[PDB]
Design an enzyme around this catalytic site. Structure first.
Site, PDB file in Angstrom:
ATOM      1  N   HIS A 195      -0.258 -12.139   1.616  1.00 55.24           N
ATOM      2  CA  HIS A 195      -1.221 -11.216   0.993  1.00 55.24           C
ATOM      3  C   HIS A 195      -2.033 -11.887  -0.124  1.00 55.24           C
ATOM      4  O   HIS A 195      -3.242 -11.685  -0.218  1.00 55.24           O
ATOM      5  CB  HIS A 195      -0.464  -9.987   0.489  1.00 55.24           C
ATOM      6  CG  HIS A 195      -1.304  -8.766   0.296  1.00 55.24           C
ATOM      7  ND1 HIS A 195      -0.780  -7.500   0.460  1.00 55.24           N
ATOM      8  CD2 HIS A 195      -2.602  -8.622  -0.090  1.00 55.24           C
ATOM      9  CE1 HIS A 195      -1.745  -6.633   0.190  1.00 55.24           C
ATOM     10  NE2 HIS A 195      -2.854  -7.279  -0.146  1.00 55.24           N
ATOM     11  N   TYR A 235       0.812  -1.215   0.000  1.00 50.64           N
ATOM     12  CA  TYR A 235       0.000   0.000   0.000  1.00 50.64           C
ATOM     13  C   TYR A 235       0.856   1.281   0.000  1.00 50.64           C
ATOM     14  O   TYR A 235       0.330   2.362  -0.275  1.00 50.64           O
ATOM     15  CB  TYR A 235      -0.984   0.031   1.182  1.00 50.64           C
ATOM     16  CG  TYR A 235      -1.971  -1.117   1.220  1.00 50.64           C
ATOM     17  CD1 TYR A 235      -2.190  -1.940   0.110  1.00 50.64           C
ATOM     18  CD2 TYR A 235      -2.687  -1.389   2.388  1.00 50.64           C
ATOM     19  CE1 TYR A 235      -3.069  -3.025   0.168  1.00 50.64           C
ATOM     20  CE2 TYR A 235      -3.579  -2.459   2.458  1.00 50.64           C
ATOM     21  CZ  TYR A 235      -3.756  -3.285   1.350  1.00 50.64           C
ATOM     22  OH  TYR A 235      -4.622  -4.358   1.443  1.00 50.64           O
ATOM     23  N   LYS A 285       0.811  -7.495   5.825  1.00 48.18           N
ATOM     24  CA  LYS A 285       0.775  -8.562   4.837  1.00 48.18           C
ATOM     25  C   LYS A 285       2.095  -8.599   4.078  1.00 48.18           C
ATOM     26  O   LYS A 285       2.642  -7.556   3.697  1.00 48.18           O
ATOM     27  CB  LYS A 285      -0.388  -8.388   3.849  1.00 48.18           C
ATOM     28  CG  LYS A 285      -1.688  -7.903   4.496  1.00 48.18           C
ATOM     29  CD  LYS A 285      -2.872  -7.917   3.552  1.00 48.18           C
ATOM     30  CE  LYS A 285      -4.084  -7.220   4.150  1.00 48.18           C
ATOM     31  NZ  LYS A 285      -3.964  -5.734   4.112  1.00 48.18           N
TER      32      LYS A 285
END
Ligand SMILES: NC(=O)c1ccc[n+]([C@@H]2O[C@H](COP(=O)([O-])OP(=O)(O)OC[C@H]3O[C@@H](n4cnc5c(N)ncnc54)[C@H](OP(=O)(O)O)[C@@H]3O)[C@@H](O)[C@H]2O)c1
Ligand SMILES: O=C(O)COc1cc(Cl)ccc1C(=O)NCc1c(F)cc(I)cc1F
Length: 316
Positions: A111, A49, A78
């Protein structure tokens, strides 16, 4: 309904958390500060992210302010696909810990089940646009995750976007040391996931629902796609309960014994989304919401569909 759910590692996980995918780095520090101030105790993060440093600034400030104690927070991150190799997992976890300014994670997830070629690029592609796999498998990656528990870096490990066969593969791993605590999957009224949820729950794995609002800010949204937040049928249920459509969409997975992680960077919505512990959807409401299933996914990606371990070819 209680605010936390018991995991198979013996720890409790808050059933409501704050999502952080797409939260801009210049807004996410305030978002997380506000969230903690208004009651959130669970933040969902990921290295991919690209905003863990900024999330971490907020967490650290609230710990320093003594707004909350570390033991009261439940921080999730993750392992990205380009770090599935034995020799990369610890460093990937440590980078996340360093960015979040933590000495442990409450939960660390694989993930996606697919390993990609390591390197700087998060999505290494061949010249025709296919993702370049790594020859890693989910079982060896799992063993590397188990080591993180045994080194004190993480309190729990789990999986994300694993289909039922992949969950089964982990549960049937020779020499399995720790079961996955969580499978984090997309789930909302247009992708209700009855089959996979029942399987995971039957094995003592807690399911976390992502994109519970249908991810209206997903970057690949088309103007034509279905919209949960605008669905008049869901709006009607919300109106009946004197709640917002988003509040109904958040309460829905909670009543299925799921954890749910709506994302917002809007302070008013962060607060709105937390005000979901003082009303109940009826069984009829629940079944009605389930009836809206259309097997529609926010999260799918063409470039990755030929990877041997791409999860969405199987029915569930
Ligand atoms: N494991 C995985 O592969 C995976 C995949 C997808 C998502 N996730 C996790 O799940 C989280 C949630 O999913 P998501 O980010 O895809 O989407 P989502 O939570 O379904 O929707 C987020 C969007 O809804 C808006 N919103 C939030 N609260 C609202 C409200 N009360 N009223 C109206 N609009 C509202 C947000 O706007 P503003 O922010 O502008 O307020 C944002 O545009 C992610 O952030 C990430 O942490 C994980
Ligand atoms: O995967 C997430 O958590 C949310 O989705 C993304 C987030 C980022 Cl920062 C970049 C890309 C995505 C995305 O494309 N997700 C869909 C996706 C994969 F990233 C990877 C696979 I394997 C399958 C798949 F559907």
């Amino acid at each position: 309904m209680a605010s936390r759910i018991l995991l198979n590692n013996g720890a409790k996980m808050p059933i409501l958390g704050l999502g952080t995918w797409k939260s801009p780095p210049g807004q996410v520090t305030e978002a997380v500060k506000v969230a903690i101030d208004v009651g959130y105790r669970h933040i969902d993060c990921a290295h991919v992210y690209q905003n863990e440093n900024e999330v971490g600034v907020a967490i650290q400030e609230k710990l320093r302010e003594q707004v909350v104690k570390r033991e009261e927070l439940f921080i999730v991150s993750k392992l990205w696909c380009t770090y599935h190799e034995k020799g990369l997992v610890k460093g990937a976890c440590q980078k996340t810990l360093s960015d979040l300014k933590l000495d442990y994670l409450d939960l660390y997830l694989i993930h996606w089940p697919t390993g990609f070629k390591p390197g700087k690029e998060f999505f290494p592609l061949d010249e025709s646009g296919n993702v370049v796999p790594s020859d890693t498998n989910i079982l060896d990656t799992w063993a590397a995750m188990e080591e993180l528990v045994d080194e004190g870096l993480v309190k729990a490990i789990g999986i994300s976007n694993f289909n039922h066969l992949q969950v089964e593969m982990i549960l049937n791993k020779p020499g399995l040391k720790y079961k996955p605590a969580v499978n984090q999957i997309e789930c909302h009224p247009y992708l209700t996931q009855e089959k996979l949820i029942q399987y995971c729950q039957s094995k003592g794995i807690v399911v976390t629902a992502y994109s519970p609002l249908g991810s209206p800010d997903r970057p690949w949204a088309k103007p034509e796609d279905p919209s949960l937040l605008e669905d008049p049928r869901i709006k009607a249920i919300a109106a009946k309960h004197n709640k917002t459509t988003a509040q109904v969409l958040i309460r829905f997975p909670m009543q299925r014994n799921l954890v749910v992680i709506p994302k917002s960077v809007t302070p008013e919505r962060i607060a709105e989304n937390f005000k979901v512990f003082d009303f109940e959807l009826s069984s009829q409401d629940m079944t009605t919401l389930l009836s809206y299933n259309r097997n529609w996914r926010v999260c799918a990606l063409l470039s990755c569909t030929s990877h041997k371990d791409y999860p969405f070819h199987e029915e569930f």
